[PDB]
């Protein structure tokens, strides 16, 4: 494949990933952007994965990795069938044709718009995993700045950016660009209550996800990755029962 | 196009070509290289463009830009038809399937090898234009350092890879490009970062363009100069058109100067 694809493949296998992502970010500064929500053509499309349960919808914010999107939430939603409805909010710019946000704030406004519409005045819960946790958080505070108070925010294995599968150039430059958007991220408070879930087992050779100011902070079995696949039933039930209380 | 392709075209239209070349060099470091002229597989192939004139063939080194390769010397070669033989030495790594030289010395050894093999002891002249002249020059020193003696060296519009001449020059180039060619462009740019005019035994003809390529607000120059030049002549045209519409005058100047040295 493309020279950008080969570079990313070889950089992960050779410890040069942080270098590859920085290069992708500069390539991404050559990409068409959108400066206002009104430029997208259509608002960010929300992708339902499990419906038919009533109650608030869980809006699951995709992460900022390359193979991010609805697959992150497939097993989480399958386990939540009947109990809670899962809809995914993709990150604009990972798919061909889509422009990148000119900055974080244009993106969150477009996202705030798309969500509030999709939810036709009903209570909804915001959810994210690793980078999607930062994205769900930034979007929750921007929603709160608008007075739209999300019912609750579920942050799953969130870390601070400044202190931590076939793919294509759009996804890879989208990741480079979204990394740049998140460099400044800081854990500003939210009125919406925060359920923090952190992995129970490290993912390779204290390393835990930490979030101060959380309403509940519970460990769940598995690794940074497997908590959302193999142990998604356990992660699901944790969120499901914890929502039944707040 | 790929994201590098769109990068490079958005870059020239927006005066960001220099930043894009740098990006591309960085990406190029992730590409397979050859570390010694035997890792290469097949040595650099030489493309004849005009044959039948006898005498030392003009070995024209390709430059390092997007559209570099044999097309640079089409008009030059057509105009020397039946006066000088012209044969192009492409730069390894611009075509799909070719790896990049681990360093400039690896490339020059490999090139020296291929040129000496092609020529078979028959005298040859090295020629180059723009960055191809730096390459033609550096190859002259490597061949001379090995006892080989190029009968002469011609530098057309040599500049030192020291900044807006490049941004202007890379503008007026704007023709199919791809990741391999683009990443090669980034890599060879990095290769010639520390190029400098070491002395040559061979006599040097220095042609420089008559008209500027773009606006230089400092009229106090933009010209291509070379110190060491046996002869230094101005030819009509700009950086680019001295090799196209004005190529016959370039050709004739070269042809005449080779009879007198």
Coordinates of C-alpha atoms in Angstrom, one line a residue:
Chain A
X1 CA 0.0 0.0 0.0
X2 CA 0.7 3.7 0.3
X3 CA 4.0 5.2 1.6
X4 CA 2.1 6.5 4.6
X5 CA 0.7 3.0 5.2
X6 CA 4.1 1.3 5.0
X7 CA 5.6 4.0 7.2
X8 CA 3.0 3.4 9.9
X9 CA 3.3 -0.4 9.7
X10 CA 7.1 -0.2 10.0
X11 CA 7.1 2.4 12.8
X12 CA 4.8 0.4 15.1
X13 CA 7.1 -2.7 14.6
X14 CA 10.2 -0.6 15.3
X15 CA 9.3 1.6 18.3
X16 CA 8.9 4.7 16.0
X17 CA 5.2 5.2 16.4
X18 CA 5.3 8.6 18.2
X19 CA 7.5 9.7 15.3
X20 CA 5.1 8.4 12.7
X21 CA 2.1 10.1 14.3
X22 CA 3.8 13.5 14.4
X23 CA 4.6 13.1 10.7
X24 CA 1.0 12.2 10.0
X25 CA -0.1 15.3 11.8
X26 CA 1.9 17.6 9.6
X27 CA 0.6 15.8 6.5
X28 CA -2.9 16.3 7.9
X29 CA -2.3 20.1 8.0
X30 CA -2.6 19.9 4.2
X31 CA -6.1 18.4 4.3
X32 CA -9.3 20.3 3.6
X33 CA -10.8 21.4 6.9
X34 CA -14.2 22.7 8.0
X35 CA -14.3 26.0 9.9
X36 CA -18.0 25.9 11.0
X37 CA -20.6 23.1 11.6
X38 CA -22.5 24.5 8.6
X39 CA -19.8 23.5 6.2
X40 CA -20.1 19.7 6.7
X41 CA -23.0 19.2 4.4
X42 CA -24.7 16.9 6.8
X43 CA -24.2 16.8 10.6
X44 CA -22.0 13.9 12.0
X45 CA -24.0 10.8 11.4
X46 CA -24.7 8.7 14.5
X47 CA -24.4 4.9 14.1
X48 CA -26.9 2.8 16.2
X49 CA -25.5 -0.6 17.2
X50 CA -28.2 -1.8 19.7
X51 CA -31.8 -0.5 19.9
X52 CA -35.1 -1.5 21.5
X53 CA -34.5 -1.1 25.3
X54 CA -35.9 2.3 26.2
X55 CA -34.3 4.7 28.6
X56 CA -31.4 7.0 27.8
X57 CA -29.3 6.2 24.7
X58 CA -25.6 5.7 25.3
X59 CA -23.8 7.9 22.8
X60 CA -20.5 6.2 22.4
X61 CA -17.8 8.6 21.1
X62 CA -15.3 6.9 18.8
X63 CA -11.6 7.1 19.7
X64 CA -8.9 8.7 17.7
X65 CA -6.9 5.7 16.6
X66 CA -6.9 4.6 13.0
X67 CA -9.1 1.5 13.3
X68 CA -11.5 3.5 15.5
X69 CA -15.2 3.8 14.9
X70 CA -18.2 1.5 15.6
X71 CA -16.1 -1.6 15.9
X72 CA -14.8 -0.3 19.3
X73 CA -18.3 -0.8 20.7
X74 CA -19.6 -3.9 18.9
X75 CA -19.3 -6.2 21.9
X76 CA -20.2 -3.5 24.4
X77 CA -23.5 -3.1 22.5
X78 CA -24.1 -6.7 22.0
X79 CA -23.9 -7.3 25.7
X80 CA -26.2 -4.3 26.3
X81 CA -29.0 -5.6 24.0
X82 CA -32.3 -5.3 25.8
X83 CA -30.8 -3.4 28.7
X84 CA -29.5 -0.2 27.1
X85 CA -29.3 1.3 23.6
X86 CA -25.9 2.0 22.1
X87 CA -25.3 4.5 19.3
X88 CA -21.8 5.4 18.1
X89 CA -20.7 9.0 17.3
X90 CA -17.8 8.7 14.8
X91 CA -14.9 11.2 14.5
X92 CA -15.3 13.3 11.4
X93 CA -12.4 13.0 9.1
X94 CA -11.5 9.3 9.4
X95 CA -13.7 8.4 6.4
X96 CA -12.9 9.2 2.8
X97 CA -14.5 12.4 1.6
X98 CA -14.9 13.8 5.2
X99 CA -13.0 17.0 6.1
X100 CA -11.0 17.4 9.3
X101 CA -12.0 19.9 12.0
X102 CA -10.1 23.1 11.8
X103 CA -9.9 23.0 15.6
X104 CA -11.4 21.1 18.5
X105 CA -14.1 23.6 19.1
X106 CA -15.6 23.5 15.6
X107 CA -15.8 19.7 15.9
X108 CA -17.5 19.7 19.3
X109 CA -20.1 22.2 18.2
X110 CA -20.9 20.1 15.2
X111 CA -21.0 17.1 17.5
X112 CA -23.1 18.8 20.1
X113 CA -25.5 19.8 17.2
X114 CA -25.7 16.2 15.8
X115 CA -26.3 14.6 19.2
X116 CA -29.0 17.0 20.5
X117 CA -30.9 16.6 17.3
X118 CA -30.6 12.8 17.3
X119 CA -31.9 12.7 20.9
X120 CA -35.1 14.8 20.2
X121 CA -35.0 16.1 23.8
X122 CA -34.5 12.7 25.5
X123 CA -31.9 12.1 28.2
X124 CA -28.7 10.6 26.8
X125 CA -25.4 9.3 28.3
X126 CA -22.0 10.0 26.8
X127 CA -19.4 7.2 26.7
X128 CA -15.8 6.9 25.5
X129 CA -12.8 4.5 25.7
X130 CA -9.2 5.6 25.9
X131 CA -9.0 8.6 23.4
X132 CA -12.8 8.4 23.0
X133 CA -12.9 9.0 26.7
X134 CA -11.2 12.4 26.2
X135 CA -13.5 13.1 23.2
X136 CA -16.6 12.2 25.2
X137 CA -15.3 14.4 28.0
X138 CA -14.5 17.5 25.9
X139 CA -17.9 17.1 24.3
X140 CA -19.6 16.8 27.6
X141 CA -18.1 20.1 28.9
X142 CA -18.9 21.9 25.6
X143 CA -22.5 20.5 25.9
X144 CA -22.7 21.8 29.5
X145 CA -21.4 25.2 28.3
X146 CA -24.6 25.2 26.2
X147 CA -26.8 24.3 29.1
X148 CA -27.6 20.9 27.6
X149 CA -26.7 18.7 30.6
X150 CA -25.8 15.1 29.6
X151 CA -27.3 12.6 31.9
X152 CA -23.9 11.0 32.7
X153 CA -20.4 10.5 31.3
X154 CA -18.7 7.1 31.2
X155 CA -15.0 7.3 30.9
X156 CA -13.2 4.0 30.2
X157 CA -9.4 3.8 30.6
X158 CA -8.8 7.5 30.0
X159 CA -5.3 8.8 30.1
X160 CA -3.9 12.4 29.7
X161 CA -2.5 13.0 26.2
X162 CA 0.5 15.0 27.3
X163 CA 1.3 12.3 29.9
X164 CA 0.4 8.8 28.5
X165 CA -6.7 -4.4 10.2
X166 CA -6.3 -2.7 6.7
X167 CA -6.0 1.1 7.0
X168 CA -5.7 4.0 4.6
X169 CA -4.2 7.5 4.4
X170 CA -7.4 9.3 5.5
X171 CA -7.6 7.2 8.7
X172 CA -3.8 7.7 9.3
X173 CA -3.9 11.4 8.7
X174 CA -7.1 11.7 10.7
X175 CA -5.2 10.1 13.6
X176 CA -2.2 12.4 13.2
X177 CA -4.6 15.4 13.1
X178 CA -6.7 14.2 16.1
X179 CA -3.6 13.7 18.2
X180 CA -2.7 17.3 17.6
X181 CA -6.3 18.4 18.7
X182 CA -5.9 16.5 22.0
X183 CA -2.4 17.6 23.0
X184 CA -3.8 20.4 25.2
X185 CA -6.5 18.2 26.8
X186 CA -7.0 18.7 30.5
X187 CA -9.5 17.1 32.9
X188 CA -11.8 20.1 33.4
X189 CA -14.7 19.3 35.8
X190 CA -18.2 18.4 34.6
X191 CA -21.6 18.8 36.3
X192 CA -22.6 15.4 34.7
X193 CA -21.5 12.6 37.0
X194 CA -18.5 10.5 35.8
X195 CA -18.3 6.8 36.0
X196 CA -14.6 5.9 35.6
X197 CA -13.8 2.4 34.6
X198 CA -10.1 1.3 34.5
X199 CA -8.5 -1.9 33.2
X200 CA -7.5 -4.5 35.7
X201 CA -4.5 -6.0 33.9
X202 CA -1.7 -4.1 32.2
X203 CA -1.4 -4.5 28.4
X204 CA 2.3 -5.3 28.1
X205 CA 5.7 -5.4 29.7
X206 CA 1.4 1.9 38.8
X207 CA 0.1 2.2 35.2
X208 CA -3.6 2.5 35.9
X209 CA -6.0 4.8 34.3
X210 CA -6.8 7.5 36.9
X211 CA -9.6 10.1 37.0
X212 CA -9.9 12.5 40.0
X213 CA -13.3 13.9 40.7
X214 CA -15.2 10.8 39.5
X215 CA -18.5 9.9 41.1
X216 CA -17.6 6.2 41.0
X217 CA -14.3 4.7 39.9
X218 CA -14.4 0.9 39.5
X219 CA -11.9 -1.6 38.2
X220 CA -13.0 -4.1 35.6
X221 CA -11.4 -7.3 34.5
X222 CA -9.1 -7.4 31.4
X223 CA -6.6 -5.2 29.7
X224 CA -6.9 -1.7 28.1
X225 CA -8.1 -3.6 25.1
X226 CA -9.8 -6.7 26.3
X227 CA -12.1 -4.8 28.7
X228 CA -14.0 -3.9 25.6
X229 CA -14.0 -7.3 23.8
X230 CA -13.5 -10.4 25.9
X231 CA -14.6 -8.8 29.2
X232 CA -17.2 -6.5 27.6
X233 CA -20.1 -8.4 29.3
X234 CA -18.5 -7.5 32.7
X235 CA -17.8 -3.9 31.6
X236 CA -21.4 -3.7 30.2
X237 CA -23.1 -4.9 33.4
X238 CA -21.0 -2.4 35.4
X239 CA -22.2 0.5 33.4
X240 CA -25.8 -0.9 33.2
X241 CA -26.1 -1.3 37.0
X242 CA -24.3 1.9 37.8
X243 CA -26.7 3.9 35.5
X244 CA -29.7 2.4 37.4
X245 CA -28.5 4.5 40.5
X246 CA -27.4 8.0 39.4
Chain B
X1 CA -4.7 10.7 -5.0
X2 CA -2.9 9.5 -1.9
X3 CA -2.5 11.8 1.1
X4 CA 1.1 12.6 0.1
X5 CA 0.0 13.4 -3.4
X6 CA -2.7 15.8 -2.2
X7 CA -0.2 17.1 0.3
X8 CA 2.4 18.0 -2.4
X9 CA -0.1 19.8 -4.7
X10 CA -1.8 21.7 -1.9
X11 CA 1.7 22.6 -0.8
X12 CA 2.9 24.1 -4.1
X13 CA -0.4 26.1 -4.6
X14 CA 0.0 27.5 -1.1
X15 CA 3.8 28.2 -1.0
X16 CA 4.4 25.3 1.4
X17 CA 6.5 23.2 -0.9
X18 CA 9.6 23.4 1.3
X19 CA 7.7 22.1 4.3
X20 CA 6.3 19.3 2.2
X21 CA 9.7 18.2 0.9
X22 CA 10.9 18.0 4.5
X23 CA 7.9 15.9 5.6
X24 CA 8.6 13.6 2.6
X25 CA 12.2 13.1 3.6
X26 CA 11.0 12.0 7.0
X27 CA 8.6 9.4 5.5
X28 CA 11.4 8.3 3.1
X29 CA 13.4 7.0 6.1
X30 CA 10.8 4.3 6.5
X31 CA 11.4 2.9 3.0
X32 CA 13.8 0.0 2.2
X33 CA 17.3 1.2 1.4
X34 CA 20.4 -0.4 -0.2
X35 CA 23.5 -0.1 1.9
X36 CA 26.1 -1.3 -0.6
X37 CA 26.2 -1.3 -4.4
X38 CA 25.7 -5.1 -4.3
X39 CA 22.5 -5.0 -2.3
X40 CA 21.0 -3.1 -5.2
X41 CA 20.2 -6.1 -7.4
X42 CA 20.4 -4.5 -10.7
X43 CA 22.7 -1.5 -11.1
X44 CA 21.3 1.8 -12.2
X45 CA 20.2 1.5 -15.8
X46 CA 21.3 4.1 -18.4
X47 CA 18.7 5.3 -20.9
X48 CA 20.1 6.3 -24.3
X49 CA 18.3 9.3 -25.9
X50 CA 20.4 10.0 -29.0
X51 CA 22.9 7.6 -30.5
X52 CA 25.1 7.6 -33.6
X53 CA 27.2 10.7 -33.1
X54 CA 30.4 9.0 -31.9
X55 CA 32.8 10.7 -29.6
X56 CA 32.4 10.7 -25.8
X57 CA 28.8 10.2 -24.9
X58 CA 27.2 12.9 -22.8
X59 CA 26.1 11.1 -19.6
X60 CA 23.3 13.2 -18.2
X61 CA 22.4 12.7 -14.6
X62 CA 18.7 13.1 -13.8
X63 CA 17.8 15.7 -11.2
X64 CA 15.9 15.1 -8.0
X65 CA 12.5 16.8 -8.5
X66 CA 9.0 15.4 -9.3
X67 CA 9.4 15.2 -13.1
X68 CA 13.1 14.2 -13.0
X69 CA 14.4 11.5 -15.2
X70 CA 14.9 11.1 -19.0
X71 CA 12.3 13.8 -19.9
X72 CA 14.6 16.6 -18.6
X73 CA 17.0 15.9 -21.6
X74 CA 14.5 15.2 -24.4
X75 CA 15.1 18.6 -26.2
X76 CA 18.8 18.7 -25.3
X77 CA 19.2 15.3 -26.9
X78 CA 17.1 16.0 -29.9
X79 CA 19.1 19.1 -30.6
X80 CA 22.4 17.2 -30.3
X81 CA 21.2 14.6 -32.8
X82 CA 24.2 13.6 -34.8
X83 CA 26.6 15.8 -32.9
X84 CA 26.8 14.2 -29.4
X85 CA 25.4 11.0 -27.9
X86 CA 23.2 11.7 -24.9
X87 CA 22.4 9.0 -22.3
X88 CA 20.6 9.6 -19.1
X89 CA 21.5 8.2 -15.7
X90 CA 18.3 8.1 -13.6
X91 CA 18.4 8.4 -9.8
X92 CA 17.7 5.1 -8.0
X93 CA 14.6 5.1 -5.9
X94 CA 12.2 7.4 -7.9
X95 CA 10.5 4.4 -9.8
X96 CA 8.3 1.9 -8.1
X97 CA 10.3 -1.2 -7.0
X98 CA 13.6 0.8 -6.6
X99 CA 15.0 1.2 -3.1
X100 CA 16.7 4.4 -1.8
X101 CA 20.5 4.7 -1.3
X102 CA 21.4 4.4 2.4
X103 CA 23.6 7.5 1.8
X104 CA 25.1 9.5 -1.0
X105 CA 28.3 7.6 -1.2
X106 CA 26.5 4.3 -1.6
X107 CA 24.6 5.8 -4.5
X108 CA 27.7 7.4 -6.1
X109 CA 29.7 4.1 -5.9
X110 CA 26.8 2.3 -7.5
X111 CA 26.5 5.0 -10.2
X112 CA 30.2 5.1 -10.9
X113 CA 30.1 1.3 -11.3
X114 CA 27.3 1.5 -13.8
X115 CA 28.7 4.5 -15.8
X116 CA 32.2 2.9 -16.1
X117 CA 30.6 -0.4 -17.2
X118 CA 28.3 1.3 -19.8
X119 CA 31.1 3.4 -21.2
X120 CA 33.7 0.5 -21.4
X121 CA 36.8 2.7 -21.1
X122 CA 35.5 5.0 -23.8
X123 CA 35.7 8.7 -22.6
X124 CA 32.5 10.2 -21.3
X125 CA 31.2 13.6 -20.3
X126 CA 29.0 14.1 -17.3
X127 CA 26.1 16.6 -17.7
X128 CA 23.5 17.8 -15.2
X129 CA 20.8 20.4 -14.7
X130 CA 19.6 22.0 -11.5
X131 CA 20.1 19.4 -8.6
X132 CA 21.1 17.0 -11.4
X133 CA 24.2 19.2 -11.7
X134 CA 25.1 18.7 -8.0
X135 CA 24.6 15.0 -8.6
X136 CA 26.7 15.1 -11.8
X137 CA 29.3 17.1 -9.9
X138 CA 29.4 14.7 -6.8
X139 CA 29.6 11.8 -9.2
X140 CA 32.6 13.4 -10.9
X141 CA 34.5 13.6 -7.6
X142 CA 33.7 10.0 -6.7
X143 CA 34.9 8.7 -10.1
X144 CA 38.0 10.9 -9.9
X145 CA 38.6 9.7 -6.4
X146 CA 38.7 6.2 -8.0
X147 CA 41.1 7.1 -10.7
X148 CA 38.4 7.2 -13.4
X149 CA 38.6 10.5 -15.4
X150 CA 35.5 12.0 -16.9
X151 CA 36.6 14.0 -19.9
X152 CA 34.5 17.0 -18.9
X153 CA 31.7 18.1 -16.7
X154 CA 28.8 20.4 -17.6
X155 CA 26.7 22.2 -14.9
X156 CA 23.5 23.8 -16.1
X157 CA 22.1 26.2 -13.5
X158 CA 23.7 24.7 -10.5
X159 CA 22.6 26.2 -7.2
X160 CA 23.9 25.4 -3.7
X161 CA 21.3 23.4 -1.7
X162 CA 21.6 26.1 1.1
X163 CA 15.6 29.7 0.3
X164 CA 12.8 31.1 -1.9
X165 CA 14.5 30.2 -5.1
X166 CA 13.5 26.7 -4.4
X167 CA 9.9 27.6 -3.4
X168 CA 9.7 29.6 -6.7
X169 CA 11.4 26.9 -8.7
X170 CA 9.2 24.1 -7.2
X171 CA 6.2 26.3 -8.0
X172 CA 6.8 26.8 -11.8
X173 CA 7.2 23.0 -12.2
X174 CA 3.5 22.5 -11.4
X175 CA 2.4 15.6 -14.8
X176 CA 2.0 12.3 -12.9
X177 CA 3.6 11.9 -9.5
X178 CA 3.3 9.2 -6.8
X179 CA 4.5 8.3 -3.3
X180 CA 7.7 6.7 -4.6
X181 CA 8.7 9.7 -6.6
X182 CA 7.6 12.1 -3.9
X183 CA 9.3 10.2 -1.1
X184 CA 12.4 9.9 -3.3
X185 CA 12.3 13.7 -3.7
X186 CA 12.3 14.1 0.1
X187 CA 15.1 11.6 0.5
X188 CA 17.4 13.0 -2.2
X189 CA 16.8 16.5 -0.8
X190 CA 18.1 15.3 2.5
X191 CA 21.0 13.5 0.7
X192 CA 22.2 16.8 -0.9
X193 CA 21.8 18.9 2.3
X194 CA 25.6 18.9 2.8
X195 CA 26.7 19.1 -0.8
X196 CA 29.6 21.4 -1.5
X197 CA 31.9 22.2 -4.5
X198 CA 34.9 20.0 -3.9
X199 CA 37.5 20.5 -6.7
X200 CA 37.5 18.5 -9.9
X201 CA 40.3 17.6 -12.3
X202 CA 37.9 17.5 -15.2
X203 CA 37.2 20.8 -17.0
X204 CA 33.8 22.4 -16.1
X205 CA 31.5 24.1 -18.5
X206 CA 29.0 26.3 -16.5
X207 CA 25.9 27.4 -18.3
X208 CA 23.5 29.8 -16.5
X209 CA 20.1 31.0 -17.4
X210 CA 19.5 34.5 -19.0
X211 CA 16.1 35.3 -17.5
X212 CA 14.9 34.9 -13.9
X213 CA 12.4 32.3 -13.0
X214 CA 10.2 34.4 -10.7
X215 CA 10.3 37.7 -8.8
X216 CA 13.4 38.4 -6.7
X217 CA 12.8 41.7 -4.9
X218 CA 16.6 42.2 -4.3
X219 CA 18.0 43.6 -7.5
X220 CA 21.4 44.1 -5.9
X221 CA 21.6 38.4 -7.8
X222 CA 19.5 35.4 -8.5
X223 CA 22.1 34.0 -11.0
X224 CA 23.6 30.6 -11.0
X225 CA 27.4 31.0 -10.3
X226 CA 30.1 28.3 -10.2
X227 CA 33.7 28.8 -9.0
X228 CA 36.1 26.5 -10.8
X229 CA 34.4 26.9 -14.2
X230 CA 36.9 26.6 -17.1
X231 CA 34.2 28.5 -19.0
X232 CA 31.0 30.2 -17.8
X233 CA 28.5 31.2 -20.4
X234 CA 25.0 32.7 -20.2
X235 CA 22.3 31.0 -22.2
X236 CA 18.8 32.3 -23.1
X237 CA 15.8 31.2 -21.2
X238 CA 14.9 30.7 -17.6
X239 CA 16.0 27.9 -15.1
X240 CA 13.4 25.7 -16.9
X241 CA 13.2 26.9 -20.5
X242 CA 16.9 26.8 -21.1
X243 CA 16.3 23.0 -21.3
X244 CA 13.1 23.1 -23.4
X245 CA 12.3 25.8 -25.9
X246 CA 15.8 27.2 -25.8
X247 CA 17.5 23.8 -25.6
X248 CA 19.1 24.1 -29.1
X249 CA 21.2 27.1 -28.0
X250 CA 22.1 25.2 -24.8
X251 CA 23.0 22.2 -27.0
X252 CA 25.1 24.3 -29.4
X253 CA 27.0 26.0 -26.6
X254 CA 27.8 22.6 -25.1
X255 CA 28.7 21.1 -28.5
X256 CA 31.0 24.1 -29.4
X257 CA 32.7 24.2 -26.0
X258 CA 33.5 20.5 -26.1
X259 CA 35.7 21.0 -29.3
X260 CA 37.9 23.6 -27.6
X261 CA 38.8 21.9 -24.3

